[PDB]
Amino acid sequence: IDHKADLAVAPLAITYVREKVIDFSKPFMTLGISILYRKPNGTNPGVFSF
Amino acid sequence: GNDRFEGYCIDLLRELSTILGFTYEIRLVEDGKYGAQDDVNGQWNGMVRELIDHKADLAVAPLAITYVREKVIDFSKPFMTLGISILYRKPNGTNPGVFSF
Amino acid sequence: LIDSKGYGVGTPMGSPYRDKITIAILQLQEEGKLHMMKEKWWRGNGCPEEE
Numbered sequence A: 001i002d003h004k005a006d007l008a009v010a011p012l013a014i015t016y017v018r019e020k021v022i023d024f025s026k027p028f029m030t031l032g033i034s035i036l037y038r039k040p041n042g043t044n045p046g047v048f049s050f
Numbered sequence B: 001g002n003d004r005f006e007g008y009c010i011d012l013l014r015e016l017s018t019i020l021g022f023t024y025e026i027r028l029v030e031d032g033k034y035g036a037q038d039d040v041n042g043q044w045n046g047m048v049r050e051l052i053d054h055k056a057d058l059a060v061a062p063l064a065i066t067y068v069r070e071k072v073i074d075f076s077k078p079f080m081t082l083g084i085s086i087l088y089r090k091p092n093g094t095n096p097g098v099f100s101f
Numbered sequence C: 001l002i003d004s005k006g007y008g009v010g011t012p013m014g015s016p017y018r019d020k021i022t023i024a025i026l027q028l029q030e031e032g033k034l035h036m037m038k039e040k041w042w043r044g045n046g047c048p049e050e051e
């Protein structure tokens, strides 16, 4: 805003509230919000499973 | 009138006029193309030259953002994410696998 | 996907409607209308046959 540095080359997503203030370019990556949760355990099917 | 049209791209166009304010008039390109620079005259084809020669205001359509198109027209930011991919028949046969026991 | 590119609402070079649709497409997207309109037209007879 107050012209301190020209570019903003960083993970700076294109959102609605930022576009009305600064000017982005067109994308170089494509995002999407998603969930990072743990993978479940292992069951270790034993040799005496019968 | 402009009532016989439907789809994604026509349901989107009434949403842009609701927020911005205008009454759009849909006019099909008569060349039937989208746009391509010929190597013999340096001229163009359908939706691109309609915007170059100012015979249009918008081009709300499946008009993909390529390198050579935005050097003459100005696009907006994307409203749909595609990529080139391959269409082919679903294989209707089963593998033999004649033992399978 | 071989590459990735997208659908731009074309404007002539120097249109003031460029930014007014650029903000507007973001407004339909942050609200969720661009996902409503895609899942109404790219819906249909989903292929049963595979199951």
Ligand SMILES: CCCCCCCC/C=C\CCCCCCCC(=O)O[C@@H](COC(=O)CCCCCCCCCCCCCCC)COP(=O)([O-])OCC[N+](C)(C)C
Residues within 6 Å of the ligand: B096, B097, B098, B099
């Ligand atoms: C467990 C419950 C049953 C137990 C019963 C016995 C089980 C254990 C015994 C033998 C194990 C046999 C399996 C071998 C290993 C498996 C993988 C393999 O390579 O096989 C190959 C086939 O091979 C055959 O055709 C198998 C023939 C079995 C004959 C044995 C009968 C015993 C009778 C003896 C009488 C003597 C008695 C008299 C003497 C006094 C794989 O096939 P492929 O060609 O490589 O590829 C598939 C082809 N395709 C591409 C078209 C899809």
Ligand SMILES: O=S1(=O)NCN(C2CC2)c2ccc(F)cc21
Residues within 6 Å of the ligand: A026, A027, A028, A029, A030, B065, B066, B078, B079, B080, B081, B082, C004, C005, C006, C007
């Ligand atoms: O053609 S673009 O404007 N710029 C290139 N890209 C990203 C590089 C994939 C994308 C990705 C998704 C789009 F919708 C548009 C574009």
